[PDB]
Amino acid sequence: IEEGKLVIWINGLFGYNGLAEVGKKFEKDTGIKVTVEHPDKLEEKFPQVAATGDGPDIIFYAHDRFGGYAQSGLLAEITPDKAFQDKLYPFTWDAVRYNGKLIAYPIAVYALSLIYNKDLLPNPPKTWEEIPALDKELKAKGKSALMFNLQEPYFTWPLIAADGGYAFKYENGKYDIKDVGVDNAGAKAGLTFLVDLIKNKHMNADTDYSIAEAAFNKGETAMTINGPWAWSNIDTSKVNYGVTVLPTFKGQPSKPFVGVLSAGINAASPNKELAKEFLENYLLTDEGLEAVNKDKPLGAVALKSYEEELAKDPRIAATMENAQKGEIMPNIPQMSAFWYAVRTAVINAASGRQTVDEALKDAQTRITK
């Protein structure tokens, strides 16, 4: 890491170009060059490189990955004063607190919502159970009912947790890493339904982010599941779409895992003062957030002043409604294991290489091993 400049990493799904614009205003005003990159699998890359003393000066990613980094001493403790802390909703601050210490700056809160084509389906389904019949019906027009990324468990987890599945129970003031619910009845029921949709051919196990996006933006599928970041391309496609509550399962709401996009500062960085200045005085301001938000919508931002101007947007109201029905992700070091195990379980169950029961049993065992 070079002293006198800022290198930032952020998930390619978000508005990295919008974040670069903020970096340019910073450079103009300060003279410091800000380089924004979106490396592949940055959440796994950062740990590796940061452990040797390099990597970016600032890393932007969902808060669930940060506990792992902090435990490894890869994050500098941020030092925001009371006046600044008061500018962001306190619940977003709790999302980046680890071991009684703040390890990152909250930027935005997001969750998945059901997105549907108003012209193909005026009244979206309130339940998962009615999608199969609805799909067959749309097949009589060469169209499908629902397409969404089945490769990443973040997308399928809302259904799995609906009837009772869960990661780590939060109890006694902390996350119980032995009390895991990926192999219970609730979780099995939800994944069995998903896998049935795939085997019965209402969905294809190969559907990924590209497939689902192209299908919905070309009006070939009535619905999709995605986050705020996808709204930009949908607007560009001209689809008359709506953003609403995820359907229910066995009479219960789908429970999406709520993520808080956070900016953490590399412990090995020689530009910690500059990082703080950029985040607190350039990014986390109405101006900075609007810049990023106009690139790719962030969802409900942590900045109270700006969030008030965004709250009006019904798409954001829908995001929050889904978020309140779900659960803020835990940020413990074991989350990496949870995601890896679940990602594998869903993939094997969906590809036939394993029965739902097997898949989940193995994920559960590996998560608590």
Ligand X SMILES: OC[C@H]1O[C@@](CO)(O[C@H]2O[C@H](CO)[C@@H](O)[C@H](O)[C@H]2O)[C@@H](O)[C@@H]1O
Please tell me the count of residues contacting Zn ion according to CB under 5 A: 3
Work out whether 295 is an interface residue with ligand X (CB under 6 A): no
Query: CA-to-CA distance for 199 and 208, rounded, in angstroms?
Result: 16
Of 255-284, binders to ligand X (CB under 6 A) are: 259
Query: CA-to-CA distance for 102 and 244, rounded, in angstroms?
Result: 33
**DSSP strand pairing (166-171 vs 174-181):** antiparallel
Work out whether 152 is an interface residue with ligand X (CB under 6 A): yes
Closest distance to ligand X from the beta carbon of 270 (Å): 27
Closer residue to Zn ion in complex, CB, 95/356 = 356
Query: CA-to-CA distance for 82 and 93, rounded, in angstroms?
Result: 12
Helices (H), 171-252: 185-199, 209-217, 231-237
Q: Which stretch binds Zn ion (CB under 5 A): 5-13, 82-90, 201-209, 341-349?
A: 201-209
Of 20-39, binders to ligand X (CB under 6 A) are: none
Of 153-172, binders to ligand X (CB under 6 A) are: 153-154
* Long-range contacts from 117-121, C-beta under 8 angstroms, 24+ separation: 117/216, 117/219, 117/221, 117/222, 117/223, 117/239, 117/240, 117/241, 118/240, 118/241, 118/242, 119/219, 119/239, 119/240, 120/219, 120/222, 121/222, 121/223
Work out whether 229 is an interface residue with ligand X (CB under 6 A): no
Q: Which stretch binds ligand X (CB under 6 A): 32-40, 59-67, 123-131, 182-190?
A: 59-67
Among 9, 10, 43, 88, binds ligand X (CB under 6 A): 43
Residue whose entry in the numeric block shows the structure tokens 């051919």: 201
Residue 214 partner contact from ligand X, Zn ion, none using kind-dependent CB cut-offs of 5 to 8 Å: none
Count other C-beta atoms under 10 Å from residue 314's C-beta. Answer: 11
Indicate the residue whose CB is closest to Zn ion.
208
> In the numeric block, which tokens belong to residue 59?
């890393």
Work out whether 208 is an interface residue with Zn ion (CB under 5 A): yes
Contact (Cβ atoms closer than 8 angstroms) between residue 351 and residue 194 = no
Specify the amino acid at residue 244.
T
Closest distance to ligand X from the beta carbon of 153 (Å): 5
Residue 132 partner contact from Zn ion, ligand X, none using kind-dependent CB cut-offs of 5 to 8 Å: Zn ion
Among 48, 85, 200, 355, binds Zn ion (CB under 5 A): 200
DSSP secondary structure string, 115-167?
EEETTT-SS--SBSTTHHHHHHHHHTTT-EEE----SSHHHHHHHHHHTT-EE
Closer residue to ligand X in complex, CB, 208/290 = 208
Closest distance to ligand X from the beta carbon of 328 (Å): 12
Residue 3: is it exposed, middle or buried by C-beta count within 10 angstroms (0-12/13-18/19+)? exposed
Closest distance to Zn ion from the beta carbon of 130 (Å): 11
DSSP secondary structure string, 341-352?
HHHHHHHHHHHS
Q: Which stretch binds ligand X (CB under 6 A): 2-10, 149-157, 281-289, 351-359?
A: 149-157
Residue 200 partner contact from ligand X, Zn ion, none using kind-dependent CB cut-offs of 5 to 8 Å: Zn ion
Closest distance to ligand X from the beta carbon of 234 (Å): 17
Among 39, 47, 80, 132, binds Zn ion (CB under 5 A): 132
DSSP secondary structure string, 215-228?
HHHTT-EEEEEE-G
Give me the residues that bind Zn ion (CB under 5 A), please.
132, 200, 208
Give me the residues that bind ligand X (CB under 6 A), please.
11, 13, 43, 62, 64-65, 152-154, 259, 339
